[PDB]
Symmetry: D2
Subunit: 373 residues, 4 copies
């Protein structure tokens, strides 16, 4: 039981000085008068912090608690434990020293001005559970305005894993990338990014579907906020609801709500339809019910079913490789991670991508992101 | 050597997972779905974070690098390695998980608005190496506006230790507290606070001395910035330079520059003069030369010679006791630690206070600060 | 629940390395070719293994499983988790790196020959849960034959704590030490030593009681093996069973089995009878029942009720102080530890000794054992 | 400077408790009475120790100091620091909790009887720097007599890495395995095992060469001790010195002394001769001098040259995979490790095998050894 095992532990984070015992000598070196010469050093040249501090291995897990898991805007106090969670995964899978920073400030322009000032302390930032659409502007501004890498799982993380899964499934489907119809349901924090990736990779006919049906420039009803996606998708200028968009569709990438895709609409999709029902905790459609309705491949966000698509397969490596290469996170480094993950296994219907525990993946990703631009 | 060591180590900060291996099981309790309930738990009652997360044992070492050691305003990059030093000391002597936070923002009203937003992540704050006189307003505002304890070594840490040193020396001097003349040279971050403490403890005739001589309301020349010390000190309405202030003076507490106290001025100070030459690296006057010129007791900031006066004897305990008792840092708590330290040894000319390594001290301070208001 | 949490942690002991992430340079120093020069220095003077290795802070927790807690001779496999438990306490309360070593060999002359061979690896040995009377010969020989300190809690550790508890209770009873009658039930590993301590301290009329009643030279029935206690105790040449020995008795120190002291026999003991029912898991008599039957002070080995008497108060400090002073464990050190614990609180009926969590105790003991002979 | 750094760290290893602050609830589960339940459980079934104790991840680094590095029989005190070295590499590359055990006992029958008794505490044993020929009998008896895996680097470790190197070089040489002539110089701890492996793999004409020249049954001069190698090698019944054995030879695997192979003898070897000069610190022949004399491929034990053949590429994985699969170390598991290492790169003259830092290798080895018999 979760709750008990927490109060027991009293936190999932800890520190630990390198040395075992301290005496007149140790101070003289790790502190004044000794460390004085490390300041002179790091001040005269900042890169030196990556050689004398932990800076080369530290990452800040920043959240305001505006979109904690599937709970909503519960706040920073409720997000704290979830951020120690991410901090743990960072240490466990990338040996990164991640420190959870939960801010009590929701105004986007201030979140940005606050994090920018943290740069001297970390080698990278990891925006976590920050609501949409403000997470879009925050991510963009920060990655541009800061010299250390800035990543946001729910957005870029998801997009990386999904693309990988997509690529492998596409191979098994044997269809041409520039000829398949992919329906993306739920254009939120993940949705938005997922579309752009599919476009980048090479998909041509992508149809965005949200609360108001197919996103179409023409029907401004569907164009809720300035997120644009309608102008770069839906080439057959389609129009209608989800059921309408699934006609002849080859892939369904749902990242919205549960039980909204009716088993019978699957038979209206082209041969061998791929179904990514990544909604938590309840998937767009039950995995088993989809196999029965005629799904060639099925994937969810849950662990109790085959083909789990979760960021864990992408952020440990990406973040480590970018924080070491001391560089910003570029589309090239993200695409390499997509390829990295994808080739980290031989694809098969019940295994299109590896599990987060395959330590080979994290090395392949760390390797790619590192060597990438 | 300092630099070689820091390079080899590659940081003085690390993190530790509580569990060794991590399997599907573990990540179900420490992260989704189990972490989901602790979110609700702390969201409904913020105080639960003290039970399920490390909030109870975590402290932030905040600095903007505006007053790093005796180097001046070298910046946050230069301050980073010195803050990792403080974080080390916190783990070593108080088993506290201290995380160094160097901000790249110097404007006081913004340092304040940024730190206030970190509350959800820490159980205590420790302002370090932040220059004067902006550190005064920052310290004040923060301790007032935040719910977790806020401390600043250079200001408060120093004053506590010095006070203890004073109390013991005064006992050996056998003179009455409300009748001794104390010359405090250098009214800076440490100076300011030291004076107020002496006053709180009971000293009556305190004489502040700075770059422009004895601080006196009348000669506004001496009143550099708004730090007021002139209005609460110097009762005999004296006036002049340092040498003028030492006439009949019983104690000299220097926390300014080196070799500024002439050995011959000492013979002009009352019987059995106490000399605290706490300036680094060079003491106001040489320790040996002072014994020679007629000094009953001598103390410096260095371990170079006997009686070392350094914050380390104070911050480990204070900070721990306060962060646990989840309370702000009060003048009562502070005074308890003064006594705490003072009575943690039997005073003698070459040993007025214990060394930082006397574990017994940190327990007496932790105990005092804890039980105090 | 205990079995729950034990599986989750997959152990109660891990290891840390000074460096976070290794590389070429590092190994060249911490291993071939560099390390070859530390080897040469340790071959040179074996006494330098305290300057270059962990020897200075390592302790082996040796057991054969012949007397694990109150379960008996369950074996080494059963003892292992209990020896990780004593290894944890060492780290928690003495910051000692204790490694649990459970031998699968019961023959005393071999246990001795195996442990003697471990000397080069440890700076101290801690014999745990080894049955009597072989634990006597083993402890003796080893302390004599090895250069590092050898200790055995449930002989020496127990005697130290009990004695401290005794002294404080004796003060509250205000009786004279050289005039009280102390009944010691269970002349085993702990029993044996407890008697000798009481004698050393100054008690004159001590009555040893075991399976065959009062130990009396005359009745060889009671003199099971060569442990002698009958020749140095029982001055009033008494004889009979437990109930017989409790007549006029001022103290009862039981360290045998549960529910063997009948509540009514307590009213046959002098005024204000002290009852130490240190048997685990079930105390010689119920704590509550004894208060009711007229017990002035009550103490058990269990944590449940008040006044808990357990080694923990005892071995962390002793072991640390002796391993640092690189000396054998002498009766003076042990006696120092007795006093140390006793004066670490102001005695009172419901608090004759502090709890294991009082970090002040472990420091006072460490301090004592260190300065002692 | 290794020395100063070892003296700074005062230990390359440390323990560390999962939890952080110990409260009266922690002991109830980790110690008494909680532990008790675990004790009984583990006693009931020994294999339960692999789930309630850190036995599943612990390994003992056992040595008597009879063959420490290239220093000789310097003793256990001199070996201690070198064993902490191996202990460090175990944690750094396999996250294994290795504890260094240096025995002060040189008689083989006692080393064996001592180690056998340690089984309850470890999940595996790692015999290190124990001289030959006693290391042969010790290794054999122990692996047979104990249930946990027993490994000895210098013997089995070396043979694994060498075979890997061999296989890749053979591929680049394009000759047939059952048709090449391999000269193995120095039939010691490594030599012995290396021969047997080459035979197992498939080499037919292997010529053993030692201090007395080619090992030949007929010339008993060459047959120093009972190590047999002469009866299973040298089919062309050759006879003579090293220079004699190199005639028409395809491979030279030297694991003896330095500068003993004359550059000109290389031209008497078949086309494209492979030269493994694994002697430390000085190789049988200089690497560069060999390239110049006509060597197709060259490898040494040293790091300053291409193709380094060192156990580090084999023991972290083997040991981890065998300690988890709770099984003895079999020839099948060793052979899989050979293949594993070999296929962990695409072979090339200046890179026939990867470096120890290629974390991919350690996973491939861990994977192989695990899945193997
Ligand atoms: N990408 C991942 O690794 C991952 C992991 C776990 C869960 N998820 C799932 O991702 C989704 C949340 O994404 P955010 O990106 O975190 O969400 P979000 O709140 O930013 O966006 C969700 C989108 O869903 C739309 N939506 C709701 N109901 C719909 C319906 N019936 N038809 C069409 N659109 C609908 C909303 O209008 C919104 O645009 C959830 O389904 C969540 O459980 C993703
Ligand atoms: N408190 C401690 O534990 C400790 C330990 C080591 C060194 N020090 C010394 O304390 C001083 C730092 O104080 P802060 O208060 O930390 O620094 P600060 O810069 O805030 O204040 C120092 C004050 O010294 C004044 N000053 C300069 N020359 C003077 C003179 N001749 N006479 C009187 N005042 C003079 C400055 O104008 C300033 O107000 C330094 O000299 C430093 O090396 C203190
Ligand atoms: N396998 C590895 O990973 C590794 C790593 C570093 C060093 N080494 C080297 O391995 C050798 C030591 O092996 P052990 O197996 O550790 O050694 P060992 O002492 O057990 O055996 C060494 C053998 O060398 C023989 N020898 C000495 N000089 C010779 C000569 N001129 N011609 C023929 N034989 C000769 C000896 O008679 C002996 O049989 C050394 O060369 C050592 O530096 C091996
Ligand atoms: Zn015990």
């Amino acid at each position: 039981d979760a709750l008990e095992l927490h109060r027991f532990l009293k936190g999932k984070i800890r520190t630990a000085l390198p040395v075992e015992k301290v005496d007149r000598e140790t101070l003289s070196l790790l502190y004044t008068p000794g460390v004085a010469d490390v300041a002179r050093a790091c001040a005269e040249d900042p890169e030196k912090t990556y050689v004398y501090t932990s800076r080369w291995n530290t990452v800040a897990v920043v959240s305001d608690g505006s979109a904690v898991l599937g709970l909503g805007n519960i706040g920073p106090y409720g997000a704290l434990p979830v951020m120690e969670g991410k901090a743990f995964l960072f240490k466990a899978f990338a040996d990164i020293d991640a420190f959870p920073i939960c801010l009590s400030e929701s105004e986007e322009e201030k979140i940005i001005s606050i994090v920018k000032s943290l740069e001297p302390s970390f080698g990278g930032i990891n925006l976590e559970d920050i609501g949409a659409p403000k997470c879009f502007r925050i991510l963009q501004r920060l990655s541009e305005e800061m010299n250390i890498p800035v990543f946001h799982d729910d957005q870029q993380g998801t997009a990386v894993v999904v693309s990988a899964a997509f690529l492998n499934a596409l191979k098994l489907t044997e269809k041409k990338i520039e000829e398949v119809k992919v329906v993306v349901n739920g254009i939120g924090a993940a949705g938005y990014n997922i579309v752009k990736f599919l476009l980048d990779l090479g998909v041509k006919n992508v149809v965005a579907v949200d609360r108001k049906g197919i996103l179409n420039e023409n029907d401004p009803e569907t164009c809720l906020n300035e997120y644009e996606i309608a102008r770069i998708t839906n080439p057959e200028r389609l129009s209608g609801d989800l059921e309408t968009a699934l006609e002849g569709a080859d892939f369904f990438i749902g990242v919205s709500r549960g039980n909204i895709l009716k088993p019978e609409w699957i038979k209206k999709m082209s041969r061998k339809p791929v179904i990514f029902a990544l909604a938590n905790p309840v998937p767009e459609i039950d995995p088993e019910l989809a196999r029965e309705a005629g799904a060639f491949i099925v994937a969810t966000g849950r662990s109790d079913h085959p083909n789990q698509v979760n960021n864990l397969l992408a952020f440990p490596g990406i973040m480590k490789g970018a924080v070491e290469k001391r560089s910003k996170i570029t589309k090239n480094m993200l695409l390499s991670a997509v390829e990295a993950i994808a080739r980290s296994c031989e694809p098969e219907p019940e295994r299109i991508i590896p599990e987060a525990f395959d330590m080979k993946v994290h090395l392949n990703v760390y390797t790619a992101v590192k060597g990438s631009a």
